[PDB]
């Protein structure tokens, strides 16, 4: 691959799901990729599978993990061109009264402050390389979702933070963009559906939530990330929707009384 | 009513439906209201019913009708403070290949150029009064809709035009805003449902398209218009959604293949 | 005042600035208002000034403060119809590398989790009254701002949270909306400008950031809040911009190389 | 080039500016490209320059031109995979009272109905190929612009139409997306600046309107188009901003009175 050759990319949560799709896409483009993940299973196997990907164990909520991730990346590959903040979690559905402030704070630690912390530690190197930041947010940050107040709020914050940082880093040539996926078929989606009374019905509903009639693939989020890194040189602060059109038109969400 | 007392308001398409709800709201606020409509039936009765509303027959697609509407309004009431461009039409559902360029042009004449023409003729008087313009657009201009390519396009244009005009008229103190209703229960909604194989099913689906579980009322669009005219003095170029939350969250719009 | 008569409203941060403008607007509408604030000076004086407003000392970041705020409101007035989450802070400008994770967390405590906590404690009473929630967010949550990564992120979260909660509470008839002000002339604005090398220049730039050529008033945010509470009965999950058109058109933000 | 090899692309207005950048990008990707333009000068030279691009004279406002364009494309290349509706015009700046209904209609003919007409004639072939439609809209359709009411309205319509058509064509696998460029340095930009009292000042202002401090290049819009055609397989109805961040943050657009 040639479109991002000679570049060094860090993908957090890259061991499975969307993150692994982004890893594969960047390897396919000719980049060297550092797979960051808190769990060893998927990321270790991915390093063995892909020439040009290596795995570094790193919990993005642990600042010393993240510092070591950046310093190890520079020590081993000599530059850093792109950070993809994909690490994140969607808790099982919760009515608002079932949420807690402390659960909210914990989700903010992963989905929001983990992204903030790696970005901060990476920006000195991204400025040297005129690199770029790609945050993986969520369509539900923009349109809301039921039984997910903390999750929706963390993604609203990521999308907004992306624009604020794009403004701060534009004088240095560092672009900052986000991708907002809708329903992408991943192990997280499958686990969440399994908790439901009728998992197959839940999966069927998830497919029909978009006009294309299917969920998206990790590879399709990966292609969007490679575009933003390698070819979107006049794009900064944008929110790239990868949703199959879920946000378009009327649907079933529930005569004038 | 006191909140818009001494003000003179023109509402196009005010003979029935949303337009009549806006007329009643402005009368209730203390304004004098000119009901403009191409059909006599509803608007004539409304003039008889409401002290402080009068009916002027006017087809907004006919420039000489509109010129007479403005000059008659000034001749009879001495000022013009607010123009509500509500006149518009939603054709029966049409697949894209069933549309025509000439039908598209005709819908543009009513939904878009009629609004443009009255606004243009009224702005000299609105500048003298530091008045304001309220365009009735549609939620589907923002999110799209199936089988309505011309309609959606005309409303996308109205919402965009509202922002361009807000920019041009801001130095003169003239605010320009729009309201984007979703499903409002009106005679147009009822007629359109009647064409469907199961009208009651279509009406039931329309109610459940919003999380509030009902369609909106003309009076609720009317309250939003009075707010924009009388109290939104720092609002210009905004799109006020009156939709019951139809744009929020996932719905049925149609595993990763 | 009649438009919200017999209703009971809680406004956080109501001692000064936007919050005090919202308090006055709701009193003017006939509501009883509980002024919540962490500082005594402004809120105590406002209680003495306004018949029908009372002051309750409450730091919204302290859960026991908030519990007492809700229980005292119910004990004293017998119902709760509207909660306005206005309490919030905009730190002095900070480049991203000057921010800290712990400062970010602290700003999240005030701007985001304080709003979450009062909303949660109030919703059982809002469900009984078919009341509503109004969150005061910020235009910069939607469009970003330079040197304000934590602030922008907290407001992106508030706006997103508003839509998620609107979805959860719609089956109970509880509407949840937000207002996104732009530049409103308040003591916070004046303090922030005073830190600048040329405060008058900074204030002049703030006025010209919107096409209307002035900043907004607290009373204008207050009118928008009363509209959402009392008359926007088909509005839920909306973001009402009160910005003077700052988001419209091109401006100075910094030939094809 | 390999990423869109074996595909056949029609680009309207492809003789110069953004359109020519899109032509070059698709040729570079391995596609065969039909350059459609109303003027011969640029498009004829481009056909001679690029193996795999051919020029067909076609005014998109003339329905018989467009029918011949589609039938000639099929006759010569055997399939049609992507239509890029780029043809469009930005009139010199006009205050609203300087616009006319008939000038508005004429601009609608080019910017809106030309796009509608080619799309309609091409969709039977796009359905056979599971092809896609890319409309070139404008950032000012979304945020407005001063002294451009007709132009802004036509682009608001294109962006909205894109979502409506995405909904209609999703069951057939045909994606419909748009690109919204901001300031791209083109012959149209240069001509418009030349009309200004100080062209260099106008160009300088155009560069500083985005946080990246420069205008965009046609090649950068071209890269975004190739991404949408070849790799955005789960994107439909999206508006891809190619603006350098012009829509982000506050700027100069013109204390609380
Ligand atoms: N799947 C969807 O439909 C969907 C939709 C919108 C947004 N998203 C977002 O996409 C991203 C990826 O989601 P997914 O579906 O691939 O989920 P996933 O659970 O399948 O994979 C997430 C990966 O991140 C890792 N991770 C979690 N916490 C971490 C931590 N503290 N440090 C490092 N790595 C950590 C996990 O171990 C896992 O390998 C998330 O940010 C999610 O919010 C997903
Ligand atoms: N009803 C909804 O759910 C809905 C949703 C979104 C937007 N809207 C918009 O709201 C507006 C009003 O719609 P409605 O549901 O009340 O429709 P309606 O058919 O019930 O009423 C429209 C009124 O406008 C009049 N009118 C039509 N053409 C006219 C012309 N050329 N000149 C003057 N008057 C003319 C009609 O005679 C009628 O009195 C329209 O612009 C429509 O697009 C409606
Ligand atoms: N002023 C603007 O231009 C502007 C723009 C956009 C959004 N906003 C938002 O509007 C809201 C009000 O801002 P303002 O300009 O009136 O600011 P302000 O500083 O003038 O007033 C805020 C009030 O909230 C109180 N408060 C702060 N922390 C609190 C806590 N922990 N518990 C209880 N009360 C607390 C303060 O004591 C003060 O009385 C904030 O949420 C702010 O982010 C303001
Ligand atoms: N340049 C910018 O900053 C900018 C910004 C936003 C959007 N746009 C849009 O991008 C598109 C291209 O603009 P540009 O800057 O390259 O302009 P341009 O004037 O440099 O090129 C437009 C091309 O389209 C052709 N064309 C015009 N009318 C036609 C017709 N009837 N039939 C066929 N071809 C026709 C012209 O002959 C020319 O070759 C337009 O739709 C424009 O609105 C441009
Ligand atoms: C949930 C499954 C899991 C989805 C999911 C999964 C991962 C993610 O990062 C975001 C989302 C948002 C929507 C979620 C669904 C709503 C209804 C349902 O069954
Ligand atoms: C249509 C009924 C009529 C609706 C309507 C009615 C009037 C209007 O100005 C806009 C709309 C948009 C949605 C329309 C429905 C989509 C499906 C259906 O049955
Ligand atoms: C800041 C002043 C204070 C503004 C302010 C004040 C309060 C607030 O809640 C939000 C904002 C956002 C914009 C801020 C300005 C940007 C440049 C400047 O000088
Ligand atoms: C105009 C130059 C030409 C720009 C232009 C050029 C082409 C186009 O398709 C859109 C636009 C929108 C902005 C326009 C500028 C605003 C101020 C100015 O000088
Ligand atoms: Na490897
Ligand atoms: Na009367
Ligand atoms: Na009192
Ligand atoms: Na050639």
Confirm or reject contact between C140 and chain D (CB < 8 A).
Answer: yes
Q: In what order do the strands lie in the sheet with A53-57?
A: A53-57, A32-37, A8-12, A82-85, A132-136, A175-181, A239-242
Q: List phi, psi (to 5°) of B31.
A: -80, 155
Nearest ligand, measured from the Cα of A107: 1
Are A252 and B247 inside 8 Å of each other by CB? no
Confirm or reject contact between D103 and chain A (CB < 8 A).
Answer: no
Chain A contact set for D22 (CB, 8 A): none
Tell me the DSSP string of D42-70.
HHHHHHHHSTTEEEEE--TTSHHHHHHHH
CA–CA dist C119, A33 (Å, integer): 43
**Residues D4, D116, D125, D151: which is the catalytic one?**
D151
Strand positions, DSSP E, B16-94: 32-37, 53-57, 82-85
Confirm or reject contact between D213 and chain C (CB < 8 A).
Answer: yes
DSSP A15: T
Instruction: Report resolution in angstroms.
Output: 2.0
D136 CA to centre of own chain: 3
CB atoms within 10 A of CB A21: 24
Are C96 and A120 inside 8 Å of each other by CB? yes
Total structural domains in chain A? 1
DSSP B110: I
Counting from 1 in the atom list of ligand 4, the atom nearest the Cα of D89 is: 43
Are D236 and A245 inside 8 Å of each other by CB? yes
CA–CA dist A112, A87 (Å, integer): 10
**Residues C125, C151, C172, C250: which is the catalytic one?**
C151
Terminal Cα distance for chain B, rounded: 60
Does B110 contact ligand 2 (Cβ within 6 A)? yes
Q: What residues pair up with A11 in beta bridges, in sequence order?
A: A35, A84
Are C237 and A144 inside 8 Å of each other by CB? yes
H/E stretch holding C8:
strand C8-12
Selecting from B119, B160, B253 the residue whose C-beta is nearest the C-beta of D144 gives: B160
Does B56 contact ligand 2 (Cβ within 6 A)? no
Residue D25's domain comprises 1-257
Nearest residue (CA) to ligand 5, atom 8: A90
Nearest residue (CA) to ligand 2, atom 11: B86
Nearest ligand, measured from the Cα of B49: 10
**C101-106: long-range contacts at Cβ-Cβ below 8 A with a sequence spacing of 24 or more?**
C101/A63, C101/A113, C101/A116, C101/A117, C103/C150, C104/A113, C104/A116, C104/C149, C104/C150, C104/C153, C105/A105, C105/A108, C105/A113
Selecting from A173, A224, A234 the residue whose C-beta is nearest the C-beta of D242 gives: A234
- The answer to whether the CB of C137 falls within 8 A of the CB of D241 is no
Dist. CA C214 → ligand 6 center (Å): 40
Does B145 contact ligand 6 (Cβ within 6 A)? yes
H/E stretch holding C72:
helix C63-77
Confirm or reject contact between B99 and chain D (CB < 8 A).
Answer: yes
Please, is B6 exposed, middle or buried when counting C-beta atoms within 10 Å of its C-beta (0-12, 13-18, 19+)? exposed
* A74 labelled ligand-binding: no
The DSSP bridge pattern shows strands A132-136 and B239-242 to be unpaired
Nearest in space to B14 (alpha carbons), one of B50, B42, B48: B42
Nearest in space to C21 (alpha carbons), one of C32, C7, C35, C8: C35
- The answer to whether the CB of C251 falls within 8 A of the CB of C154 is no
Are B211 and C237 inside 8 Å of each other by CB? yes
Within 192-211 of A, beta carbons closer than 8 Å to B belong to 203, 205-211
Q: In what order do the strands lie in the sheet with B8-12?
A: B53-57, B32-37, B8-12, B82-85, B132-136, B175-181, B239-242
Are D234 and A242 inside 8 Å of each other by CB? yes
CATH code, domain with D240:
3.40.50.720
Ligand 3 pocket, residues with Cβ under 6 angstroms? C 12-13, 15-19, 37-39, 42, 59-61, 86-90, 110, 136, 138, 181, 183-184, 186-189
* D81 labelled ligand-binding: no
Q: What is the dihedral of CA A44, A48, A50, A52, to 10 degrees?
A: 90
- The answer to whether the CB of D210 falls within 8 A of the CB of D246 is yes
Please, is D135 exposed, middle or buried when counting C-beta atoms within 10 Å of its C-beta (0-12, 13-18, 19+)? buried
Q: What is the dihedral of CA B68, B73, B79, B82, to 10 degrees?
A: -90
CA–CA dist A223, A225 (Å, integer): 5
Does A198 contact ligand 1 (Cβ within 6 A)? no
């Amino acid at each position: 691959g040639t479109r991002y050759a000679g570049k060094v990319v860090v993908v957090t949560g890259g061991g499975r799901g969307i993150g692994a799709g982004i890893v594969r896409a960047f390897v396919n483009s000719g980049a060297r990729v550092v797979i960051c993940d808190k769990d060893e299973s998927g990321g270790r196997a991915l390093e063995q599978e892909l020439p040009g990907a290596v795995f570094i164990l790193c919990d993005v909520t642990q600042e010393d993990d993240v510092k070591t991730l950046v310093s190890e990346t520079i020590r081993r590959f000599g530059r850093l061109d792109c950070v993809v903040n994909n690490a994140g979690h969607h808790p099982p559905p919760q009515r608002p009264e079932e949420t807690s402030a402390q659960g909210f704070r914990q989700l903010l630690e992963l989905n929001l402050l983990g992204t903030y912390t790696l970005t901060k530690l990476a920006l000195p190197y991204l400025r040297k390389s005129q690199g770029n930041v790609i945050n993986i947010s969520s369509l539900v940050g923009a349109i809301g979702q039921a039984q997910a107040v903390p999750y929706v709020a963390t993604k609203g914050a990521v999308t907004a933070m992306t624009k604020a940082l794009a403004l701060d880093e534009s004088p240095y040539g560092v672009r900052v963009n986000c991708i907002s996926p809708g329903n992408i078929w991943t192990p997280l989606w499958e686990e969440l559906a399994a908790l439901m009374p009728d998992p197959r019905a839940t999966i069927r509903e998830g497919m029909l939530a978009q006009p294309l009639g299917r969920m998206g693939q990790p590879a399709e989020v990966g292609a969007a990330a490679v575009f933003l890194a390698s070819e979107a040189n006049f794009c900064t602060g944008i929110e790239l929707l990868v949703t199959g059109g879920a946000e378009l038109g009327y649907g079933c969400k529930a005569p004038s009384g």
